Amino acid sequence: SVAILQKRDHEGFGFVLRGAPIEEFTPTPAFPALQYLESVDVEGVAWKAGLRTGDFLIEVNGVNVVKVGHKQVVGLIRQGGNRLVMKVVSVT
Numbered sequence: 399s400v401a402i403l404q405k406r407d408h409e410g411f412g413f414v415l416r417g418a419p420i421e422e423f424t425p426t427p428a429f430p431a432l433q434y435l436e437s438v439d440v441e442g443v444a445w446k447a448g449l450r451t452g453d454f455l456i457e458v459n460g461v462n463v464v465k466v467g468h469k470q471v472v473g474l475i476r477q478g479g480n481r482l483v484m485k486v487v488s489v490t
Contacts, residue, residue: 399448399485399486399487399488400483400484400485400486401444401447401448401449401482401483401484401486402447402482402483403443403444403447403449403481403482403483403484404443404480404481405443405480406480407480409443410443411442411443411444411475411482412438412439412442412443412444412445413435413436413437413438413439413442413444413449414435414436414437415433415434415435415436415455415468415471415472415475416433416434416435416436416468417431417432417433417434417455417467417468417471418432418468420432420465420466420467421465423465425464425465427489428489429454429489430454430456430464430487430489431454431455431456431463431464431487432455432463432464432465432466432467432468433454433455433463433466433468433471434452434453434454434455435449435450435451435452435453435454435455435486436451437451438450438451438453449484449486450488450490452488452489452490453486453487453488454486454487454488454489455471455484455485455486456484456485456486456487457483457484457485458471458474458475458482458483458484458485459474459475459477459478459482459483459484460483461474
C-alpha cells in the first residue's frame with residue numbers, strides 16, 4: 399500500500415524503524431524488505447495514515463529501499479521534512 403504523512407515541525411511521525419552484508423540479501427514473501435516498522439504509536443500521525451507495526455518498507459519518497467541500508471532510509475525520511483510518502487507491504 400501507500401501512506402501519506404503530514405506533521406508539525408516539532409512532532410515526529412510516530413513510528414520506529416528497524417533493519418540490518420546487505421549485498422547478497424534476498425527478498426522473500428515473508429521478509430520482503432530490509433526495513434520494517436517496529437512500532438506505530440496508536441492514534442499517531444503514521445497510524446492515522448493507516449501504517450501498522452509489521453509493515454515492511456518498499457519505497458520512501460520515490461526511492462526503492464528493499465536493499466538499501468538503514469542510515470540511508472532514515473536519511474530519506476529526514477530530507478522530506480514534514481512530508482513523507484512510503485510504499486509498504488504488510489506480511490500479516
